[PDB]
Amino acid sequence: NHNAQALNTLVKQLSSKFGAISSVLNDILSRLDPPEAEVQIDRLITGRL
Amino acid sequence: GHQPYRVVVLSFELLHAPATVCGPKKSTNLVKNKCVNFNFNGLTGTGVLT
Amino acid sequence: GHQPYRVVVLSFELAPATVCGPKKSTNLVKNKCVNFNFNGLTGTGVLT
Amino acid sequence: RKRISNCVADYSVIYNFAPFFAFKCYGVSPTKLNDLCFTNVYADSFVIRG
Amino acid sequence: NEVSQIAPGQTGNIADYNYKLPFTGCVINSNKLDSKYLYR
């Protein structure tokens, strides 16, 4: 039960924006230029880490 | 200063029954059971279709 | 917005240096806990 | 409050009108609008102050 | 009007078939003396 709960919680974490416009790496690279997408991507990277 | 300015605002939304106002692009065919890229109406990804 | 405009751009390559700004040159100091600014390398330490 | 639908959405026709000093966006970066199949567009125009 | 042409990124014709900004340099006026030039 504990292992299943931990894995499910880890999997479900890939749905929070953490302060970004979107939680998907697609549909944010297309909607933003290279010198702006880095700021949004960094927050997702830090949260997932 | 204190001189008329013309201002035009455009308002949109991304995911609300997408069937209208689209940019200029062509279309390709469909493939099955093959590792392919996607440009499905805006959404981008990779994988196979069933 | 329609009037043309001339622009002048610049760049750097921050690696030997050749376009160093106007600074002064001093004398080398032997082993002692001293500061150093070696062609932009700023720090403190003992040199031997 | 004009409603826009079923467009080519070629944003290259614009930028040739009267010279503009503000072209600022929120949530979408310019030079990308040729992509991004949208749903509908609302356009408004007015004169506010100098 | 700079925007597209200056700074990395952007594709504004003058930023699509001309000088591309890769960048760490400092960017610094023909309003006069040019009141009356290829475009690529």
Curated annotation (Swiss-Prot), chain A:
Residues 1-41 form a coiled coil. Changing residue 30 to A: In strain: Alpha/B.1.1.7. Subunit of the fusion protein that is processed upon entry into the host cell. Mediates fusion of the virion and cellular membranes by functioning as a class I viral fusion protein. Contains a viral fusion peptide that is unmasked after S2 cleavage. This cleavage can occur at the cell membrane by host TMPRSS2 or during endocytosis by host CSTL. In either case, this triggers an extensive and irreversible conformational change that leads to fusion of the viral envelope with the cellular cytoplasmic membrane, releasing viral genomic RNA into the host cell cytoplasm. This is Spike protein S2'.
